Design a protein around this ligand. Sequence first.
Ligand SMILES: [Zn+2]
Ligand SMILES: [Zn+2]
Ligand SMILES: [Zn+2]
Ligand SMILES: [Zn+2]
Ligand SMILES: [Zn+2]
Ligand SMILES: [Zn+2]
Lengths: 466, 466
Amino acid sequence: MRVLVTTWGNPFQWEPITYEYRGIKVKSRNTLPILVKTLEPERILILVADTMANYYDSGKNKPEIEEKSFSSYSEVVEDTKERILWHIKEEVIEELREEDPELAKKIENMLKDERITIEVLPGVGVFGNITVEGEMLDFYYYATYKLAEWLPVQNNLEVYLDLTHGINFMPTFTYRALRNLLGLLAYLYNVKFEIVNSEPYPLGVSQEIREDTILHIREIGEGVVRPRPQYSPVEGKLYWNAFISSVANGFPLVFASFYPNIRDVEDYLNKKLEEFLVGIEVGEREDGKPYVKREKALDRSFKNASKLYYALRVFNTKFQNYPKKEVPIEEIMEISKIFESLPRIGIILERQVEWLRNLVYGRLWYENGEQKIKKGLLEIIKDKKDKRKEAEALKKGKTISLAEAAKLTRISPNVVRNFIAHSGFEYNIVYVKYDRLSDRLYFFYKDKEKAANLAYEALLYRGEKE
Amino acid sequence: MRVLVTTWGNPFQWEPITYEYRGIKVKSRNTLPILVKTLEPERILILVADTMANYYDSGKNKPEIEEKSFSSYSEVVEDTKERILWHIKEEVIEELREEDPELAKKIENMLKDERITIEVLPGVGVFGNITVEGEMLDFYYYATYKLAEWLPVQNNLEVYLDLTHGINFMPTFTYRALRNLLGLLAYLYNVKFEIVNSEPYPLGVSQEIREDTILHIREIGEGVVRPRPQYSPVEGKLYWNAFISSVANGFPLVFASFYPNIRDVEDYLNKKLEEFLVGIEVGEREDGKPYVKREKALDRSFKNASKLYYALRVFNTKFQNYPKKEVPIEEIMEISKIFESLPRIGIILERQVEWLRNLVYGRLWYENGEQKIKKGLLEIIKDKKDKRKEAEALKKGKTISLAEAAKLTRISPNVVRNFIAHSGFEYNIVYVKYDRLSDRLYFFYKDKEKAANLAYEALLYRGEKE
Ligand SMILES: [Zn+2]
Ligand SMILES: [Zn+2]
Ligand SMILES: [Zn+2]
Ligand SMILES: [Zn+2]
Ligand SMILES: [Zn+2]
Ligand SMILES: [Zn+2]
């Protein structure tokens, strides 16, 4: 699938110009036509700022919507959308009817379906049409949230990000939010991330020099996305962080054990978001214009939470039985196969995980043509002769330590390091239990709290240099 | 140390406004004053684009420099600097004499020393003062080069990046180039990376509403920099890539063995750069204005090379005996201590490296109060009785394999994976040699070519998911 995300400033300030891209040339005020014609996206998200609210050009009498008086940020948002929607219908499409009539119908139809959506984000700025006061980071944090909801979850996803019409701080914020999110999608699926940006609109030049000027849509993306560990906690959410640490460092047992319920996070976002919107005062400037003042701000936890929200949407398409406190070696392998995307960690897990597979089944290997082997908890439990207290306890279904498991067969003072080294599989805290009804060996954290803290700590952990 | 990097568009279009930041409020057309006053940087790099060349406002008669005719990109660059330098002396400082006279002298003096430097980068744009044609990425690639030269190499470095006056594509490109470079500095030294960005200049509003508007300098940085593996090769430079792979994955032997000579890369940059500038045609538009046309473009290798250039400046402050083909276990530990910054890899190395330290010295450890031990190549070579052919060959100073070394004591079909797993320490290709004059065990790659290829491959390597 191919999707396009594009940041827009003030569309009513752009004049018609010809855009070139991959051999194709389409004239418009917006890049959208050339991008839709060249790329043929299946979806399009348009990001604008509430600083667009109430905009009106008296000399060009556009957009053809009256200036209003607002009382809630709710109206402010819907009004902004109305005007941007107008520029799209009454200008983008309209003016295409004389340049590429088929494209106009294509954009016209995409606008019918829910192919293209406009979203209004919190901005900053004192303009002739409105004044918006608040924290700048709000745009960024909310951006991460919006992308967290809209963004697809599929294999071979191609995300094109057009920063052409982005105006102040918008570009970098959106670029950062998007690469963070796509970086999480890359743990399971393949995805390309391209950034497009057209050359600058010719300024202060003769009408003759402006008509010979054709703007190139440039590709400046990073290409194939590689997953990247994001050490981004959510204040006051131990378990979540523990899970966040597992996706960052690769802790299979911690992954399954603290897998958060997407609705629990989804509702955290909802509450924090509601507390934000309500802090938004909607008044009136000296000159009668709208005055939006945010007295509450979003924090990085809201951003990290939003990130967690997208990760879970990516993972939930492959794991539904989690959280699970007692997981079998089979699922540990599944979970471990996720980090294959991050070679260094997946390779660390493959060995560590095979070892754990050997505990349960036994180890069959060769040394110089010779043929040596060892049995696992599985066999020991069957053999009626084994009277070793560990196998005794295990045979009854009693809980046995991972170290105790190392004894029935063959297998530092800085807990965090060792915990990182062992991928969360500490022989002190990881236990085993045999269930006869299901007929399987289960691994689990006996000490729920300390497993999470050790995990959490391994997210904030930083080696020593100086 | 504290340094500031700030992107500028067209300074002659900005009007005076009051800037607030960390409780401090300074009025100017530029953010530089407020940033110098609040931060007190020891250095300042100002990034501008050649699209500033020949700029002149007829109504404000500024800058007070004539429009010229150019024949070489060399003049174009020096002229741009002249005008930006002018805005700084005749406006920034000048207008401060009536707002904060002490600050003016401070900026005046910093301009005397080489505290602040202006650099001209390749831009894109058709303007009333000049037309610049070329690839947009050139700004980005050259940016990475410029930062590679200017940027300091020290512990506790604080880089502030002001994107406030950045205009089109400049911000994101500079943000990306800077985080890549700082990310390499973080392998050895601590460094903070903050991004500052002022709120938007009030547009289309009454003179009364504009005077009540105070712009906030906002901090939107990432804070403490964490080193990040950069899989960025340089086409046609096997050895370099092998070294690049070692800094990315953590291959101590590969690090010391293919350590490139900084001058060899420095000269690669010089040649590629010269071939770029020479492709820059400097002509004249229909309207008499300057016409800069780049017929040659920089490629990502130039960027990656520039990155390699900065990494070497960071590493050269701690390693001068490299490249070294025969390195002792002592240096392997030094090299290994670098990745302590990236916990997951450093922890992988600590074990793998201690093992290699045990080969040379022997392993002294305890099992249940009991006291077992083994001897290393060191001791075996001393003991006159050992007649084992391996110790025999070794005692004569003959080359022995790492596997052969595993035998004299105690210690898949996908070569790349295993090579990654073993951190480049394959028992097949890593050899040992004892030198009696120096009295030390040396590890080395017998097959120079294949060690580099396997390394290189491990940079392009990607696990399997679907
Ligand atoms: Zn013409
Ligand atoms: Zn209030
Ligand atoms: Zn341990
Ligand atoms: Zn007033
Ligand atoms: Zn030519
Ligand atoms: Zn192997």
